């Protein structure tokens, strides 16, 4: 049963997981889930597109986490940027100190 299955992937299940951590007793409708899927795709494209630009400006071929960071600063409103940087630095730390 593989035929009519061009995998249409989305962030929906990962959105769902994060939901349960912040509001364990709250559900979310399909249309709402669709909004969130669009949200994550949008922010992804904005952030990555911006990091791409940074790399080209500086004559580099690698999108590193430094490019993701600067992009975040340039694109997120003040305080929302501060927290995002914090979450990002945090996860790039734990990842390194791991196996």
């Amino acid at each position: 049963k593989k035929r009519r299955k061009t995998r249409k992937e989305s962030y929906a299940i990962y959105v769902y997981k994060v939901l349960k951590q912040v509001h364990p007793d709250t559900g979310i409708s399909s249309k709402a889930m669709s909004i969130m899927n669009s949200f994550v795709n949008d922010v992804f494209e904005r952030i990555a597109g911006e990091a791409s630009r940074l790399a080209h400006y500086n004559k580099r071929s690698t999108i590193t986490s430094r490019e993701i960071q600067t992009a975040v600063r340039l694109l997120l409103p003040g305080e929302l940027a501060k927290h995002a940087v914090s979450e990002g630095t945090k996860a790039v730390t734990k990842y390194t100190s791991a196996k």
Partner: protein, 79 residues
């Protein structure tokens, strides 16, 4: 009809959602002409994406991409 199918009560309900209390009688023609210009602009772009992909069906994606490049991004139909 057609454009005239967008009716006075419809426009009025819109305006109300926009917080409008009192509406001049000529607002109805101005609005219709405004809606037509919006749709042409968007549909042109959507149909252009459609032609490109050699389809005969305008798909939600075609509309969503047209909206994105007119700086009117829409969330909810990106399936």
């Amino acid at each position: 009809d057609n454009i005239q199918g967008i009716t006075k009560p419809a426009i009025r309900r819109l305006a109300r959602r926009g917080g409008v209390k009192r509406i001049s009688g000529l607002i109805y023609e101005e609005t219709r002409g405004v809606l037509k210009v919006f749709l042409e602009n968007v549909i042109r772009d959507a149909v252009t994406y459609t032609e490109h992909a050699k389809r005969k069906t305008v798909t939600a994606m075609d509309v969503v991409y047209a909206l994105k490049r007119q700086g009117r991004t829409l969330y909810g139909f990106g399936g």
